[PDB]
Design a protein around this ligand. Structure first.
Ligand SMILES: *[C@@H]1O[C@H](CO)[C@@H](O[C@@H]2O[C@H](CO)[C@@H](O[C@@H]3O[C@H](CO[C@H]4O[C@H](CO)[C@@H](O)[C@H](O[C@H]5O[C@H](CO)[C@@H](O)[C@H](O)[C@@H]5O[C@H]5O[C@H](CO)[C@@H](O)[C@H](O)[C@@H]5O)[C@@H]4O)[C@@H](O)[C@H](O[C@H]4O[C@H](CO)[C@@H](O)[C@H](O)[C@@H]4O[C@H]4O[C@H](CO)[C@@H](O)[C@H](O)[C@@H]4O)[C@@H]3O)[C@H](O)[C@H]2NC(C)=O)[C@H](O)[C@H]1NC(C)=O
Ligand SMILES: CNC(=O)c1nc(N2CNc3cc(OC)c(OC)cc32)sc1-c1ccc(Cl)cc1
Ligand SMILES: [Ca+2]
Ligand SMILES: [Cl-]
Ligand code: NA
Ligand SMILES: [Zn+2]
Length: 808
């Protein structure tokens, strides 16, 4: 109930929300069916349109008019946005030369430059270049301000997850908005685009920018606009609020456009009908900037022009149907479209089995346009698992395709030519970022970055302390002229031991053998030097990784590699080695095929044992530093140390072997040498975070050897590839991956072929940021470089996507 009898007189677009059933006059009241009776008449005036004309200049104020052209309008804050152009001979903002904004140029009583976020739905990154002819206002913001060639959204690349990720800095699994449609089993409640459930606060976790601001004494405009408020009125309202007295005036505002997404769905991302919505958005930017200039705020306000996701060509005839795969199609609920999420239609059905569902969906047709995953097996870069609203079964749908349950769902539940939602590394899902204002840099292009990073910057722009979030604060300092945040490196928590020779071979009863008793101060001094670290500067190029949790571990030096060996997990946390452009690949000698060697620096009690692997019929082992890349025959023995061994399924060893034998060398030739850091990851509860020992669900049979869920590698070289990786004077270049450690290669439909046809494709899907590895391991990398720490943060957030170059 709302007592709609009260009145909006002097309350139009009020900022505090009045508690029901007092009637509302704020910008969301329509959405709630709760506006006062006179809201439309008073607050949504439209008479005369939105532009001054020659003949309105100096008019006597008529309060009925949508906006005013009278002499008093500047100080009332309510002129048409083009008032000074038409009536005072001023130029439009877009017609002015751009001029660096070195300092904020703000009216008196402004305590900080205000922030205005101009968010546009479905604004695909290539529109910046492809529509530049019809968007001069946007083009000027882009060329004069700071811009990225594109910005990466979060998965899924849908509106509500991205809007709220923008607002909170959090992955959808943490903020809770995991799709446009959701079921929460604990509330037994459903969230949908249409309807009132979406308004319930329980869906929205984390702390969005407006709440962060409010809590810290920074006033915020109300960010959300009822759909029937036209864009012109949204702009005028923001501008009116900007005229409030100092003590009442917000410092942060949002405008939202439903375009170009809306037309994009109907016409496709480059339909000829798309020119007009792009022109109209640009005109709205024009209105805002002319309005700021009238208020003398165009060199005072920071403006962020930001999209949520792009748009791809998708039509009804590119739909896959679960009914062509599944026998019991009516025993499941599917969330359909550009992703698939599956659960049991009823919780009382105990004949529901995920494994059989996954199998009926795995590599079943030649050209299959979606791939089933249990959510914990999805690419860790998606961070899409640790939420009860995300169904255990997931379908990653190929770009340009839909998945649906049955053909009737598509003609009774074609109409559309565009959609979005696909994997966030897909080129057509990329969106835009432009920052313009005193706090942003002048004419600066910055590399592509992820939208999870912006909450921190928005907080920096307003002098706020960000709530805890998934951005890496400092990684976007390079976008800013001032207000940079200067983070410190985290402190190391555990210091390593440096064990020397402490154990005789006969103390080890591990059931391991090696044909190695097949052996002076020429070499005998040289080996001692190598075991004490004489080559460490070659193989440990950026310092040792720091351990940021309490544990017991040893540093182990070798000719060809250095490792941080965990006495708790019985394997290295990391293994670091450098392969130059010139290194050669050898094979494992025949006599060394099953060789494993006790490490006389590390006790029997803290070593793996070969017998466990022998007894465990599912589990084999591999090596972290690869024997194929040994610098010499003698050095090769080091690679067979029990301390360099890790458990691997035979199916995974196919992947790992090819990476270590073929691919490391390939990257060293292409990148002029590479440094590799590899190790295990344990994330049994799929939370993206390092497991403690008591969270491990699988061990090598009969032992306390924990089985990794994933293996990572970080591959660093010199960004200027004319310099070798081990003598790099400047910026670095990185790619990383987090490969799932799976007992089968079901994920790879072409796996029965030779690894040269399928392994590299798998590795690309599981591309990762260094930061994702840090969360997963409790390690901090790149602690000793010659680079600034902010630059290194930006490196750690880098994602190598393998997409072709954005454009054409
Ligand atoms: C991305 O950035 C974020 C933000 O930093 C990272 O997420 C944080 O991770 C923290 C560490 O894991 C986690 O800390 C826990 O908080 C618990 C208190 O939780 C509430 O309070 C906070 C504070 O305001 C709030 O933000 C939380 O919000 C979550 O839940 C609400 C309501 O359900 C949702 O609205 C919201 O969406 C959010 O959900 C997300 O997080 C929860 C987990 O908190 C998930 O379950 C959801 O799926 C979703 O992802 C909460 O309202 C606190 O109780 C925890 O403490 C336990 O564990 C510690 C170990 O040190 C121990 O000291 C305690 O004993 C305690 O154990 C007890 O509970 C256990 C579980 O029931 C039980 O097993 C034990 O036996 C004990 O009884 C813990 O400190 C933090 O809450 C989240 N924050 C957010 C916003 O998600 C995220 O990790 C980052 N991701 C990556 C990849 O880096
Ligand atoms: C992709 N979108 C956004 O990021 C976004 N959208 C907004 N509005 C405002 N009014 C509105 C009405 C809608 O429906 C009518 C709507 O539907 C989906 C969305 C919105 S505000 C905003 C935003 C602005 C700043 C920050 Cl920090 C975070 C988010
Ligand atoms: Ca974990
Ligand atoms: Cl969804
Ligand atoms: Na075995
Ligand atoms: Zn859309």
């Amino acid at each position: 109930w709302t007592a709609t009898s009260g009145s909006c007189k002097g309350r139009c677009f009020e900022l505090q929300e009045v508690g029901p059933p007092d009637c509302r006059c704020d910008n969301l009241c329509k959405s709630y069916s709760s506006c006062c009776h006179d809201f439309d008449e008073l607050c949504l005036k439209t008479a005369r349109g939105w532009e001054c004309t020659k003949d309105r200049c100096g008019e006597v104020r008529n309060e009925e008019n949508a906006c005013h052209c009278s002499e008093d309008c500047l100080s009332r804050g309510d002129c048409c946005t083009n008032y000074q152009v038409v009536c005072k001979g001023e130029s439009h903002w877009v017609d002015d030369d751009c001029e660096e904004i070195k300092v904020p140029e703000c009216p008196a009583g402004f305590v900080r430059p205000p922030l205005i976020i101009f968010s546009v739905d479905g604004f695909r990154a290539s529109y910046m270049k492809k529509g530049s002819k019809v968007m001069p206002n946007i083009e000027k913001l882009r060329s004069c301000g700071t811009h990225a060639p594109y910005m990466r959204p979060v998965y899924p690349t849908k509106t509500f997850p991205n809007l709220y990720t923008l607002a909170t800095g959090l992955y959808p699994e943490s903020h809770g908005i995991v799709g446009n449609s959701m079921y929460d089993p604990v509330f037994d409640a459903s969230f949908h685009l249409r309807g009132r459930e979406k308004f319930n606060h329980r869906w929205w976790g984390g702390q969005p920018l407006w709440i962060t601001a409010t809590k810290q004494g920074v006033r915020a405009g109300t960010f959300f606009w009822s759909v029937s408020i036209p864009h012109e009125r949204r702009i005028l309202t923001i501008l009116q609020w900007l005229s409030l007295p100092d003590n009442e005036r917000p410092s942060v505002y949002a405008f939202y456009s439903e375009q170009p997404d809306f037309s994009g769905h109907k016409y496709g991302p480059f339909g000829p009908e798309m020119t007009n919505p792009l022109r109209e958005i640009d005109k709205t930017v024009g209105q805002l900037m002319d309005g700021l200039k009238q208020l003398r705020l165009h060199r005072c306000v920071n403006v962020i022009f930001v999209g949520d996701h792009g748009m791809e060509d998708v039509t009804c005839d590119r739909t896959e149907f679960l009914s062509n795969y599944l026998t019991n199609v009516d025993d499941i609920t599917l969330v359909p479209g550009t992703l698939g999420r599956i659960r049991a239609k009823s919780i009382n059905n105990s004949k529901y089995d995920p494994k059989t569902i996954i199998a009926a969906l795995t590599c079943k047709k030649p050209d299959q346009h979606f791939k089933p995953y249990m959510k914990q097996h999805l690419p860790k870069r998606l961070h899409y698992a640790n939420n009860r609203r995300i169904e255990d079964i997931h379908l990653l749908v190929d770009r340009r395709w839909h998945v649906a349950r049955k053909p009737l769902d598509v003609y009774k539940k074609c109409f559309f030519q565009g959609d979005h939602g696909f994997d966030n590394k897909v080129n057509s899902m990329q969106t835009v970022f432009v920052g313009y204002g005193p706090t942003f840099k002048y004419r600066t292009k910055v590399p592509p970055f992820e939208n999870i990073e912006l909450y921190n910057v928005m907080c920096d722009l307003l002098g706020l302390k960000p709530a805890p979030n998934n951005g890496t604060h400092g990684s976007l300092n390079h976008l800013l002229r001032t207000n940079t945040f200067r983070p410190t490196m985290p402190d190391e928590v555990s210091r390593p031991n440096y064990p020397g020779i402490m154990y005789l071979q006969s103390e080890f009863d591990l059931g391991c053998t090696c044909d190695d008793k097949v052996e002076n101060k020429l070499e005998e001094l040289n080996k001692r030097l190598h075991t004490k670290g004489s080559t460490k500067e070659r193989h440990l190029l950026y310092g040792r990784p720091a351990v940021l949790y309490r544990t017991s571990y040893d540093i182990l030096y070798h000719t060809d590699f250095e490792s941080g060996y965990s006495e708790i997990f019985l394997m290295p946390l990391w293994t670091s080695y450098t392969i130059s452009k010139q290194a050669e690949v050898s094979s494992i000698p025949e006599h060394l095929t099953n060789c494993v060697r006790p490490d006389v620096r590390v006790s029997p009690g803290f070593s793996q044992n070969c017998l466990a692997y022998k007894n465990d019929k599912q589990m084999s082992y591999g090596f972290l530093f690869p024997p194929y890349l040994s610098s010499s025959p003698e050095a090769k023995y080091d690679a067979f140390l029990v301390t360099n061994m890790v458990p691997m399924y035979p199916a995974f060893k196919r992947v790992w072997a090819y990476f270590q034998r073929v691919l490391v060398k390939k990257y060293a030739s292409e990148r002029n040498g590479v440094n590799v850091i590899s190790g295990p990851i344990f994330d049994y509860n799929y939370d993206g975070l390092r497991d403690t020992e008591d969270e491990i669900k699988q061990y090598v049979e009969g032992s306390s050897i924990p089985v990794p869920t994933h293996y990572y590698s970080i591959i660093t070289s010199c960004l200027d590839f004319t310099q070798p990786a081990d003598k790099c004077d400047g910026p670095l270049s990185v790619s990383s991956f987090i490969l799932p450690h799976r007992p089968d290669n079901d994920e790879s439909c072409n796996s029965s072929e030779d690894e040269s046809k399928w392994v590299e494709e798998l590795m690309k899907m599981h591309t990762a940021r260094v930061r994702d590895i840090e969360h997963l391991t409790g390690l901090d990398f790149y602690r000793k470089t010659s680079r600034s720490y902010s630059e290194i943060l930006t490196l750690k957030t880098y994602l190598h996507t393998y997409e072709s170059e954005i454009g054409g």
